[PDB]
Amino acid sequence: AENLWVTVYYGVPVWKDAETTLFCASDHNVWATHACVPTDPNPQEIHLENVTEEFNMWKNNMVEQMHTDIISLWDQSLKPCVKLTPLCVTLQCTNVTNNITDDMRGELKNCSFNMTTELRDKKQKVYSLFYRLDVVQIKEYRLINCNTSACTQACPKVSFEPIPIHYCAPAGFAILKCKDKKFNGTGPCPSVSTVQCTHGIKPVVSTQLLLNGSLAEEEVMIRSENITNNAKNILVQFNTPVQINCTRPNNNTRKSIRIGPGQAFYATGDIIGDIRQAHCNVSKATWNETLGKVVKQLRKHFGNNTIIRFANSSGGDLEVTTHSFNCGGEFFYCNTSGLFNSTWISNSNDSITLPCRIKQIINMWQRIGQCMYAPPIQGVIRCVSNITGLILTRDGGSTNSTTETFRPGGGDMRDNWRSELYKYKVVKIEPLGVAPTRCKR
Amino acid sequence: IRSENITNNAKNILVQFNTPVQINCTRPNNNTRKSIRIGPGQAFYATG
Amino acid sequence: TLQCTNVTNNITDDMRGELKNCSFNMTTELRDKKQKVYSLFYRLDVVQ
Ligand SMILES: *[C@@H]1O[C@H](CO)[C@@H](O[C@@H]2O[C@H](CO)[C@@H](O[C@@H]3O[C@H](CO)[C@@H](O)[C@H](O[C@H]4O[C@H](CO)[C@@H](O)[C@H](O)[C@@H]4O[C@H]4O[C@H](CO)[C@@H](O)[C@H](O)[C@@H]4O)[C@@H]3O)[C@H](O)[C@H]2NC(C)=O)[C@H](O)[C@H]1NC(C)=O
Ligand SMILES: *[C@@H]1O[C@H](CO)[C@@H](O[C@@H]2O[C@H](CO)[C@@H](O)[C@H](O)[C@H]2NC(C)=O)[C@H](O)[C@H]1NC(C)=O
Ligand SMILES: *[C@@H]1O[C@H](CO)[C@@H](O[C@@H]2O[C@H](CO)[C@@H](O)[C@H](O)[C@H]2NC(C)=O)[C@H](O)[C@H]1NC(C)=O
Ligand SMILES: *[C@@H]1O[C@H](CO)[C@@H](O[C@@H]2O[C@H](CO)[C@@H](O)[C@H](O)[C@H]2NC(C)=O)[C@H](O)[C@H]1NC(C)=O
Ligand SMILES: *[C@@H]1O[C@H](CO)[C@@H](O[C@@H]2O[C@H](CO)[C@@H](O)[C@H](O)[C@H]2NC(C)=O)[C@H](O)[C@H]1NC(C)=O
Ligand SMILES: *[C@@H]1O[C@H](CO)[C@@H](O[C@@H]2O[C@H](CO)[C@@H](O)[C@H](O)[C@H]2NC(C)=O)[C@H](O)[C@H]1NC(C)=O
Ligand SMILES: *[C@@H]1O[C@H](CO)[C@@H](O[C@@H]2O[C@H](CO)[C@@H](O)[C@H](O)[C@H]2NC(C)=O)[C@H](O)[C@H]1NC(C)=O
Ligand SMILES: *[C@@H]1O[C@H](CO)[C@@H](O[C@@H]2O[C@H](CO)[C@@H](O)[C@H](O)[C@H]2NC(C)=O)[C@H](O)[C@H]1NC(C)=O
Ligand SMILES: *[C@@H]1O[C@H](CO)[C@@H](O[C@@H]2O[C@H](CO)[C@@H](O)[C@H](O)[C@H]2NC(C)=O)[C@H](O)[C@H]1NC(C)=O
Ligand SMILES: *[C@@H]1O[C@H](CO)[C@@H](O[C@@H]2O[C@H](CO)[C@@H](O)[C@H](O)[C@H]2NC(C)=O)[C@H](O)[C@H]1NC(C)=O
Ligand SMILES: *[C@@H]1O[C@H](CO)[C@@H](O)[C@H](O)[C@H]1NC(C)=O
Ligand SMILES: *[C@@H]1O[C@H](CO)[C@@H](O)[C@H](O)[C@H]1NC(C)=O
Ligand SMILES: *[C@@H]1O[C@H](CO)[C@@H](O)[C@H](O)[C@H]1NC(C)=O
Ligand SMILES: *[C@@H]1O[C@H](CO)[C@@H](O)[C@H](O)[C@H]1NC(C)=O
Ligand SMILES: *[C@@H]1O[C@H](CO)[C@@H](O)[C@H](O)[C@H]1NC(C)=O
Ligand SMILES: *[C@@H]1O[C@H](CO)[C@@H](O)[C@H](O)[C@H]1NC(C)=O
Ligand SMILES: *[C@@H]1O[C@H](CO)[C@@H](O)[C@H](O)[C@H]1NC(C)=O
Ligand SMILES: *[C@@H]1O[C@H](CO)[C@@H](O)[C@H](O)[C@H]1NC(C)=O
Ligand SMILES: *[C@@H]1O[C@H](CO)[C@@H](O)[C@H](O)[C@H]1NC(C)=O
Ligand SMILES: *[C@@H]1O[C@H](CO)[C@@H](O)[C@H](O)[C@H]1NC(C)=O
C-alpha cells in the first residue's frame, strides 16, 4: 500500500573521490605564471555545515599533480637556454689562495681552459673560478657532470623566486578544504568547506627545513602516514616561524665569454676583497624553544618519559645530508649540525652559525643525466627566511632502549608539497540521483 | 588469394595460408658488444 | 675515415670479406681529446 515511484533529481549535492587535472591561477620567472588564469579578486569559500569528510594527505593526487607540474615548468624554463657542451674540456686548475680564510682551504679553483669562439676556426684561452664540488681531477680537472650528461646554463633573466600558485579544479569538480585546526592530515574532518582553489602555495625547494610555508594556527603539528613505522618521514609544522639569515658574502664578479654565435657563458672572474665561507644564522633561543615544542608534541606519540634526541643526518648525497636550498640564484648546501644536536629528558643574543657550501652544477630533482648550471650572481647576496617545519626521520625503533632519535631528512620534494596540500582534496560532483516519491508521471 | 585486380600484373597478390610454415632464423656468431663514450652521456655500441 | 681490414680469423668460405675490422678516431667526453677505437662493421654498412 505504498505506491512509490522512482523520481529523478538533477543538481543533487553529492560528490565522489576523484582524480582530475587542476589548472593554475595566480595574481621572467621559472614558475611560468604567464600561462595561468587570473585569480579572482574576492575568492569565494562555501562553508559546508553538518558535513564530515574523510581526508588523507598521504594519498592525495594533488601532490603528484603538483610534482609533475613543477618538474614540467622547470624543464620548460630551461629549454630556451644555452647548452654548455663546449664546457667539457680539460681544465688547468690552481688553488685560489688570495685573501682566503682557514675555512676556505682549496674550496675555490682558478681554472684556465681553451674555449670555442663565434668563429668555428678560432679558440680563446679563458679562465673561471669554480667550486671544489663542481670539478673533479682527471692539476688537470673536468666538470663533475661531463661523464653523465651536458649541462644547460640557466638563462640569467629568469628568476628562481617562488611565486604563490593556486590549483583550481575544472567544471564538475570541487576542492574540499578541511578547516579543522589540530587536524593531523588523516581521518574524518568535521569542519569542511568548498573552495574554487587553495591559498597561494609557493613552490619552495628545500631539504631538512620547510621554508616560507604555512604555520599551524594552534600549536606544533606532527604528521606521519604511520608514526610507528620509522621508514615514514615525519612532517613537523611550526606555529612560530624561526628566522634564518643566509648569506654569501663574496663580492663575486660575473664575466661573459662568447662561446658561439649568440651563446654566452657566464664565468666567475674574481672575488673583490676577502674570500670567506657563506653561512646561515639561526637564533639559538628560538630554535631551543621550537625544539622544546616539537619534543613535547612528539612525547604524545612516543611516550611521556622517553628521551628525545636530535642528531645529524645519517648519510647520502649532499642534497639530503645538508639543508639544500636556493638563495637569490645561488644554491646553498648548509651543514645543519648545530641545529639537530641535543638530548631532551622528561622532567641571549648569539645565534647558531651553520656553514654552507655553494654549488653551480645542480641536479634539482632526483634525476640522473639532467643537470643545470647556475650562472654566478653579481655581488654579495643575503636572504632571510622563515623555518616553518621539519622533515624528520626516526632512527632505529627497537624496544630494548627508551630513547628516540630523530634526524633531518628530505630529498623527495613531494613531502614539501604535502605539507601545504594536507588540508585539501578533490572530488567530482554527482548531480544525478533517484529517490522514492508518491508522485506518478 | 586476394588482389585488387587479379588480371592486372602490376597489382600485388596477397596469399594467406591456412597451415603456417615454421621458419627458424639464426645468427650463430657470438657477438661481443663494447661501449665507447662518444660524448657527455653519449655511448656508441660497437661490435668488439 | 675508417681504416678497414678483412676479418679473416675463423671465417667460413661463405663469409669472405663480409666483416670489416675498422679502426677510427673518435670524440670523447672531453671536447679536446680523441680516442682511437675499432669496430666490426658489415660489408653492406661501409663503402670505400
Ligand atoms: C623566503 O621569502 C623571502 C622574502 O620574500 C626571500 O628573501 C627575498 O629574496 C629575494 C630574492 O633572493 C630578494 O630579492 C632580491 O633583492 C636583491 C637586493 O635588493 C636584489 O638585488 C634582487 O634583484 C636582482 O635579482 C632579481 C632576480 O632575483 C632580478 O629580477 C633583478 O633585476 C636583480 O637582478 C640584477 O642584479 C643582479 C645582482 O647584481 C644581477 O645578477 C642581474 O643580472 C641584474 O643585473 C632581488 O630583487 C629579497 O630582497 C629577499 N627579501 C628578504 C627580506 O630577505 C627568501 O629568499 C625566501 N626563501 C626561499 C628559500 O625562497
Ligand atoms: C686566476 O688566474 C688568472 C690567470 O692565471 C689571474 O689573472 C691574472 O691576474 C694577474 C694579476 O694578479 C695579471 O697580471 C694577469 O695578467 C692575469 N692573467 C690573465 C690571463 O688574465 C687571476 O687573477 C686569478 N684569480 C684568482 C682569484 O686567483
Ligand atoms: C690550449 O691549447 C694550446 C694548444 O693546443 C695548449 O698549448 C699546448 O700545450 C701542450 C701541453 O698540454 C703542448 O704540448 C703544446 O706544445 C702546446 N701548444 C701551444 C701552441 O702552446 C694549451 O696548454 C691549452 N690550454 C689549456 C688551459 O688547456
Ligand atoms: C615570516 O613570518 C612572519 C610572522 O608569521 C610573517 O609576518 C607576517 O606577514 C603577514 C603577511 O602575509 C602579515 O599579515 C602578518 O601580520 C605578519 N606577522 C608578523 C608578526 O609580522 C612574515 O611575512 C614571514 N616571512 C616570510 C618570508 O614568510
Ligand atoms: C651571522 O652571525 C655572525 C656572528 O656569529 C655574524 O658575524 C658578524 O658580522 C658582523 C656584520 O654585521 C660583523 O660586524 C662582526 O664582526 C661579525 N662577527 C663575527 C664573529 O663573525 C654574521 O655577520 C652573521 N651573518 C648574517 C647573514 O646574519
Ligand atoms: C654529524 O656529526 C658527526 C660527528 O659529530 C660528523 O662526523 C664527522 O664527519 C667528518 C666528515 O666525514 C669527519 O671528518 C669527522 O671526523 C667526523 N667526526 C666524528 C666525531 O666522527 C658528521 O659528519 C656530522 N654529519 C653531517 C651530515 O655533517
Ligand atoms: C658539520 O659540522 C660539524 C661540526 O663542526 C663537523 O664535525 C667536525 O668535523 C671536523 C672534521 O673536519 C672535526 O675536526 C671536528 O671535530 C668535528 N666537530 C664535531 C663537533 O663533531 C662535520 O664534519 C660537518 N659536516 C661536514 C659534512 O663537513
Ligand atoms: C638449419 O639447418 C642446418 C642443416 O640443414 C643446421 O645445421 C646443423 O645444426 C646442428 C645444430 O643442432 C648441428 O649439430 C649439425 O652439425 C649442423 N649440420 C650442418 C650440415 O650444418 C642448422 O643448425 C639449422 N639452424 C637452425 C636455426 O635451425
Ligand atoms: C680488429 O683489430 C683490432 C686492432 O687492429 C684487434 O685488436 C688487437 O688484438 C690483438 C690480439 O690478436 C692484440 O694483441 C692487440 O693489442 C689488439 N689491438 C687493439 C688496438 O685492441 C682485434 O683483435 C681485431 N679483431 C678481429 C676480429 O680481427
Ligand atoms: C687518428 O688521427 C691521427 C692523427 O691525426 C692519425 O695519425 C696520422 O696519420 C697521418 C696519415 O693519415 C699521418 O700523416 C700523421 O703523421 C699521423 N699523425 C699521428 C700523430 O699519428 C691516425 O692515422 C688516425 N687514425 C685513424 C684510424 O684514422
Ligand atoms: C690545494 O689546497 C688543498 C687543501 O688546502 C690541497 O689538498 C691541495 O693539494 C692543494 N693543491 C695544490 C696546491 O695544487
Ligand atoms: C663519473 O665520474 C665520477 C667520478 O669520476 C664517478 O663517481 C661516477 O660514477 C661517474 N659516472 C659515470 C656515469 O661514469
Ligand atoms: C591522527 O592520526 C591518526 C592516524 O590513524 C588518526 O587515527 C587520528 O584520528 C588522527 N587524529 C585526529 C584528532 O583525528
Ligand atoms: C605501521 O608500521 C608497523 C611496522 O613498523 C606495522 O607493524 C603496522 O601494521 C603499520 N601500521 C599501519 C596502520 O599500516
Ligand atoms: C663589490 O665590488 C664592487 C666593485 O668594486 C663595488 O662597487 C661594490 O660596492 C662592492 N660591494 C660590496 C658589498 O663590497
Ligand atoms: C636576521 O636579520 C634581521 C634583520 O634583517 C635581524 O633583525 C635578525 O635578528 C637576524 N636574525 C638572526 C638569527 O641573525
Ligand atoms: C653538539 O653538542 C655537544 C654538547 O653535548 C657539543 O659538545 C658539540 O660541540 C655540539 N656540536 C655541534 C656541531 O654543535
Ligand atoms: C584490370 O586490369 C586490366 C588490365 O589493365 C584492365 O583491362 C581491367 O579493366 C582491370 N579491371 C578493373 C576492374 O579495373
Ligand atoms: C659466448 O661467449 C661468452 C663469453 O666467452 C660465453 O659466456 C657464452 O657461453 C658464449 N655463448 C655461446 C652460445 O657460445
Ligand atoms: C677482402 O676480401 C674480399 C673478398 O675476399 C676481397 O675482395 C678484398 O680485396 C679483400 N681486401 C683486402 C685483403 O684488403
CSV table of N, CA and C and ligand atoms in Angstrom, one decimal, chain A residues 136-137 142 144 147-148, chain B residues 37, chain C residues 29, ligand 12:
chain,number,residue,atom,x,y,z
A,136,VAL,N,86.4,17.8,-10.8
A,136,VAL,CA,87.0,16.5,-10.3
A,136,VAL,C,88.3,16.3,-11.1
A,137,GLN,N,89.3,15.9,-10.4
A,137,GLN,CA,90.6,15.7,-11.0
A,137,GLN,C,90.6,14.5,-12.0
A,142,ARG,N,88.1,18.3,-14.6
A,142,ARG,CA,87.0,18.4,-15.5
A,142,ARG,C,85.7,18.6,-14.7
A,144,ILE,N,82.1,18.1,-13.1
A,144,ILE,CA,81.6,16.8,-12.5
A,144,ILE,C,80.6,16.1,-13.4
A,147,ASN,N,80.8,13.3,-17.4
A,147,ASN,CA,80.7,11.9,-17.7
A,147,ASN,C,79.3,11.4,-17.5
A,148,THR,N,78.3,12.2,-17.3
A,148,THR,CA,76.9,11.8,-17.2
A,148,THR,C,76.0,12.5,-18.2
B,37,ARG,N,82.4,5.8,-25.1
B,37,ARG,CA,81.9,7.1,-24.7
B,37,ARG,C,82.2,8.1,-25.8
C,29,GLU,N,84.4,12.3,-24.1
C,29,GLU,CA,83.6,13.3,-23.3
C,29,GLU,C,84.2,14.6,-23.2
D,12,LIG,C1,81.6,9.9,-13.3
D,12,LIG,O1,82.8,10.1,-12.5
D,12,LIG,C2,82.6,10.0,-11.1
D,12,LIG,C3,84.0,10.3,-10.5
D,12,LIG,O2,85.0,10.4,-11.5
D,12,LIG,C4,82.0,8.7,-10.7
D,12,LIG,O3,81.8,8.7,-9.3
D,12,LIG,C5,80.7,8.4,-11.4
D,12,LIG,O4,80.2,7.1,-11.2
D,12,LIG,C6,80.9,8.6,-12.9
D,12,LIG,N1,79.7,8.4,-13.7
D,12,LIG,C7,79.5,7.7,-14.8
D,12,LIG,C8,78.2,7.7,-15.4
D,12,LIG,O5,80.5,7.2,-15.3
